Amino acid sequence: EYKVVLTFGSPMSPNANNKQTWVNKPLDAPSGHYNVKIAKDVDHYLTMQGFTSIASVDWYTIDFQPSEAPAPIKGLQVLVNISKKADVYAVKQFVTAQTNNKHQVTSLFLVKVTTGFQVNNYLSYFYRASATGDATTNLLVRGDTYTAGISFTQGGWYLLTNTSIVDGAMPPGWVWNNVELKTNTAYHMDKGLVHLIMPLPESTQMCYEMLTSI
Amino acid sequence: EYKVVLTFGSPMSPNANNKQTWVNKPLDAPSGHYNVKIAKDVDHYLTMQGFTSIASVDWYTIDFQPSEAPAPIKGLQVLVNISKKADVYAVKQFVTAQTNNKHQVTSLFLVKVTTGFQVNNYLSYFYRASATGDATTNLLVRGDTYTAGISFTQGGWYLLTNTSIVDGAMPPGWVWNNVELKTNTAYHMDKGLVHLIMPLPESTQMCYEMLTSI
């Protein structure tokens, strides 16, 4: 286990400092294109939603003493179609009980790209309508998608996310349920989503406690 | 200067895990009530907007070595009307250039309450409308306010925020411009706002580099 300090880079196109954060929404992609998947094997993988460039990474022990970067996690891969494009160095899940029967799971993967690539994906964003009075108004994902290209550069660090909503029974450890972003379903905030409302300014630092194994 | 790790408590009423974060919006308060102000003197103060309970604080040097908590910052006060309700232990501003002529300044104050108190304030929340296509849709503050009570407990740590939008010329160091949350004006995200969309789960940790002087 490590304490990991990420220094955020500039937003990845089509994102911008003054725009809503676009994330991949579905479990499919346009014709001729592919999702980015973070996979343990063919039956256990999560589809990339959030994509964020990380300028640098500082590694520490769990009590904050300085450490050299670990080696890649064996047996995890960032895949496009059937080819591995990045190594995974650290992982973390945030599990939130919205209710006992509705859990939100946000998975974060710190990855380093080994073959540069681009994908066209169906993108959307979080939004929240104004409402009158003290009524609850939900954090939602826009239904419509905007098809756009996303580019990943060799040698770059990236932070990838996936958020699932799991109904009913939960498994006991790492959750592999792969669920597209829902529209019409309330999300909560968790520490894995704080960078996905609008891009945080380049040079912003965030600290996470992360694992180097599933 | 310190690296400060905050462990978030439960949301403060009227907030909840499943609700938008309510923040104080204006520079005034209902009849018979008062804003919370974080003041250096009568001509230099910021009005509380965000209010968040912090369960615990861990203090480190700038390179992450463990440290005892500092003493309160002399000459800063958390005031209600004309009475000091809390000591300020650490401060930080995030300054964002939306454009060269529109800067966003988010100030964070880590405080410990010394006399418990309650205020009724005019509250609002951040929202973002759905829009079609790849149009930018702004992060805004709802115009309408909801009047509600906010309670602060003796001995508790709290994180207070203020965000200003400054038009034109900027001062060179700590910005004392006190500006209510605007409606109809785009906000960006900064590291001081990441906990103010919806409450982060109790026990979430966030790390900040903070000062113990202005």
Author numbering:
A (entry chain A), B (entry chain A): 431 to 644
Paper text:
The purified HAstV-1 CP spike was crystallized in the space group P41212, and a native diffraction data set was collected to 0.95-Å resolution. Structural alignment of the HAstV-1 and HAstV-8 CP spike dimer structures by the DaliLite server revealed nearly identical structures, with an RMSD of 0.8 Å. We mapped these sites in the context of our immature and mature HAstV models and found that the P site lies on the most outward side of the virus and is exposed in both immature and mature HAstV.
HAstV particles display T=3 icosahedral symmetry formed by 180 copies of the capsid protein (CP), which undergoes proteolytic maturation to generate infectious HAstV particles. The AstV CP is composed of several domains, including a highly basic N-terminal domain, a core domain, a spike domain, and a C-terminal acidic domain.
